[PDB]
Design a protein around this ligand. Structure first.
Ligand code: HEM
Ligand code: HEM
Ligand SMILES: Nc1ccc2ccc(CCNCCc3cccc(Cl)c3)cc2n1
Ligand SMILES: Nc1ccc2ccc(CCNCCc3cccc(Cl)c3)cc2n1
Ligand SMILES: C[C@H](O)[C@H](O)[C@H]1CNc2nc(N)[nH]c(=O)c2N1
Ligand SMILES: C[C@H](O)[C@H](O)[C@H]1CNc2nc(N)[nH]c(=O)c2N1
Ligand SMILES: [Zn+2]
Lengths: 411, 407
């Protein structure tokens, strides 16, 4: 079956056949759409089919489908599953899998870049200090003095569910949050719970507004250990505005490297529970969400105050005015310090070209509209006007429960 | 089967049970989500009638009363011999209010229970329809103090005697293709404008020409009528600080009055049911003015503001967008014409969702449409999970009549 999507600004119609290869479920039914819901041990039984599908995809990608090398690989993986109950991926297959998990990431607007991904194989890692060393190298490589490069580091796969590698941080680099006795928060409110765990585990909190959190690292199912990323490795950008000189006096800064570290990478039925990956920021991530969400730094009032806007009526659009200024400031600061960043016009335009190319060469591009449309100026970006189909392909990145909810403490 | 929706800004969690009463399908399957697709007999009619009357009699606390059973009997008799049936006024009014209540794409539903319903089922000719429509326009406009209303023409019979308003809204501006190849006026209406012109309309060929009405009674050929200009309330657009803004020559009309939808109540189809409320500012300032395939004025405005249009990263489009929108709101307010900003409307919608969850067990909501086309994450609806599903009575889209009509 063929499925058409229309852009209502250009009248370009595209045809999706890729959705046929989808297996995993959406959450939706014929009677309910769950499209806006944030989150809607394997045995050899389920394993060999998942391995086979993956290797068929990999061998097709290299124009060796049905070859002797393809068939010998299937046989070898199959032996390995029944005798050991799991299997190991070749390097080439790991690289292919990690790239494809990105290619298949329907909430990611930056996928035009999917084929340029530096894969660091850390499957020989055994200890938390070993993990720290791998993460450091990743941060240094990805940072590249401001000229950001996409990278993923892949720790050993899950075995019995009891020896998991996990990075406890949600991102490699994030600012601490501290709930104060009077109920105000110092720093980033999103990271209060995590901050609390760090303190308990023995971190000495500097207790300021922008303290870089320590890494909390779990190797091989053991209790996690704390490490401080060398400050010299953490690139940061002070935020100033091109026209407003008081902007600097707000005391704002952000880090340059967005590095998600809490997702699970699934490849051929194997589960890589620690697979931190990084790219570079779209400006609205910081300016709209991190700074202006009510649940985050929440700077809108204090910025509009200093611009002396009319704040007595929401219909003056004082919030919308302050919002644009803060986002100009974020983009200006990053560009001036030569740290890679993309604005939301440029990123969405690239995405639309990526998506058209993908329908052409691949037969589809799964896309989650709710997430692809940027959180400001939605309809003046081309994605707002693009119909999109959302479905789940493997390899994939998946959410997993926060490790502190599940970890069995060894003491 | 009992579903949770969470607000991620406030942590409030609501449980939805109302979805279990859904009949119609979504377009989605367990394998594919179609949330962003814009458009995704006697034997049949009695279950539809029963389901409707059941919810009606339940709403007036008379489920399982003699009067309930009698009506089911009476409508059932009427279907058997006439192959259709007629709604009592009270059922009709309930049905229309509930179609709005169930409109999952409408952010303005906190108002659903204050809807003035005009029964035009006695209408027979296009002149008749023109009269009812002018009366609707004058009533709703209320000199700028807008009131919600719907006018309901006779229901579909054998489908060869359909009542239709060919216009997409009662009040819209003309669109003309130029010798240049550019477009004068509103590009969205270019085709309907040619239909009017080929029908007889002498077009003024300007930027902001109110279209005539093209009205179809009883499957006959549609006829043209100008709405008395005095009944069309328009607002010249100025900025509260940019003097030069008025020089742009922008204006918009006060009454948003959608006229091409189909109202389904209890299996009965009302193919002409024009309805109106009032505008949220972004519909005009973000979509009508700034869409690339609409009036598309961002470039002219940014220029007058002397913004650096060299790089997208100066956010010049975003800056111009905010000012256009402050101006739309300012103009309507200064002229005392009802308008709501997107911060106010979305705050209202959250309050409405909570009311519906409490009183009704849920609220169908389409996040893709409810989140405003600017400043999304700074409105509370952005952070609100929503379940989308289809309840009846409903408003539905239907084919443009010119692809259907037999001349
Ligand atoms: C190279 C520059 C990149 C840009 C500009 C970019 C842009 C984005 C943005 C703006 C989001 C939404 C983030 C949010 O609202 O929380 C996102 C989501 C995502 N991207 Fe990227 N991306 C990039 C690279 C990557 C890489 C390297 C990967 C992994 C290999 C990745 C995988 C994802 C995933 C899995 C999500 C969804 C996360 C979730 O559901 O919470 N992207 N992307
Ligand atoms: C009272 C003020 C009202 C406000 C502020 C309002 C707000 C809105 C807005 C902003 C939209 C999105 C429109 C678009 O982007 O094209 C919408 C959609 C809609 N509203 Fe309303 N609404 C109001 C009254 C009404 C009334 C009186 C009805 C019917 C009785 C109605 C039924 C609908 C329907 C059916 C849609 C979706 C139409 C479609 O799918 O194309 N609304 N509403
Ligand atoms: N610039 C980039 C690049 C890659 C990214 C990859 C992933 C992400 C999103 C990670 N944040 C999780 C947000 C979230 C998801 C679900 C629930 C909650 Cl509370 C919060 C952002 C990215 N930004
Ligand atoms: N302020 C209001 C009140 C009620 C409304 C009721 C409906 C509408 C939308 C009417 N236009 C339909 C837009 C559309 C939908 C699907 C396809 C296409 Cl081409 C165009 C706007 C409203 N605005
Ligand atoms: C409830 C809603 O699904 C949720 O707020 C989503 C909306 N769209 C988003 N889009 C992106 N990119 N990131 C987000 O965190 C969200 N949040
Ligand atoms: C493709 C996408 O579904 C389409 O552009 C939608 C998005 N959200 C919308 N939201 C509203 N309120 N009105 C619209 O016309 C649209 N268009
Ligand atoms: Zn869906």
């Amino acid at each position: 079956r063929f499925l058409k999507v229309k852009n209502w600004e250009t009248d370009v119609v595209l045809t999706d056949t890729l959705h046929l290869k989808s297996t995993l479920e959406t959450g939706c039914t014929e009677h309910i759409c769950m499209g806006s819901i944030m989150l809607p041990v394997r045995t050899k039984d389920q394993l060999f089919p998942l391995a086979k599908e993956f290797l068929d995809q990999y061998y097709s990608s290299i124009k060796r489908f049905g070859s002797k090398a393809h068939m010998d690989r299937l046989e070898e993986v199959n032996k390995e599953i029944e005798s050991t109950s799991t299997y190991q991926l070749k390097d080439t297959e790991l690289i292919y899998g990690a790239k494809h998990a990105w290619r298949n990431a329907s909430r990611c607007v930056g996928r035009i870049q999917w084929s340029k991904l530096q894969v660091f194989d850390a499957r020989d890692c055994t200890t938390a200090h070993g993990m720290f060393n791998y993460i450091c190298n990743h941060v240094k490589y990805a940072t590249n003095k401001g000229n950001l490069r996409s990278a993923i580091t892949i720790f050993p796969q899950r075995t019995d569910g009891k020896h998991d590698f996990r990075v406890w941080n949600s991102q490699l680099i994030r600012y601490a949050g501290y709930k104060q006795p009077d109920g105000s928060t110092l720093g980033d409110p999103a990271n209060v719970q995590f901050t609390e765990i760090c303190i308990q585990q023995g971190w000495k909190a500097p207790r300021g507004r922008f303290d870089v959190l320590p890494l909390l690292l779990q190797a091989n199912g053991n209790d996690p250990e704390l490490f401080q990323i060398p400050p010299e490795l953490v690139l940061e950008v002070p935020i100033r505005h091109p026209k407003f000189d008081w902007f600097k006096d707000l005391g704002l800064k952000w880090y340059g490297l967005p590095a998600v570290s809490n997702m699970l990478l699934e490849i051929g039925g194997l589960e890589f529970s620690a697979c931190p990956f990084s790219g570079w920021y779209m400006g609205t991530e910081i300016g709209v969400r991190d700074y202006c969400d009510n649940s985050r730094y929440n700077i809108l009032e204090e910025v509009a105050k200093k611009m002396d806007l009319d704040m007595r009526k929401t219909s003056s659009l004082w919030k919308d005015q302050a919002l644009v200024e803060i986002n100009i400031a974020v983009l200006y600061s990053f560009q001036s310090d030569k740290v890679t960043i993309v604005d939301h016009h440029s990123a969405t335009e690239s995405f639309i070209k990526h998506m058209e190319n993908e329908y052409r060469c691949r037969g589809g591009c799964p896309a989650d509209w709710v997430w692809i449309v940027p959180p400001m100026s939605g309809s003046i970006t081309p994605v707002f006007h693009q119909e999109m189909l959302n479905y789940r392909l493997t390899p994939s990145f998946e959410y997993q429960p926060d490790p502190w909810n599940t970890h069995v403490w060894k003491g």
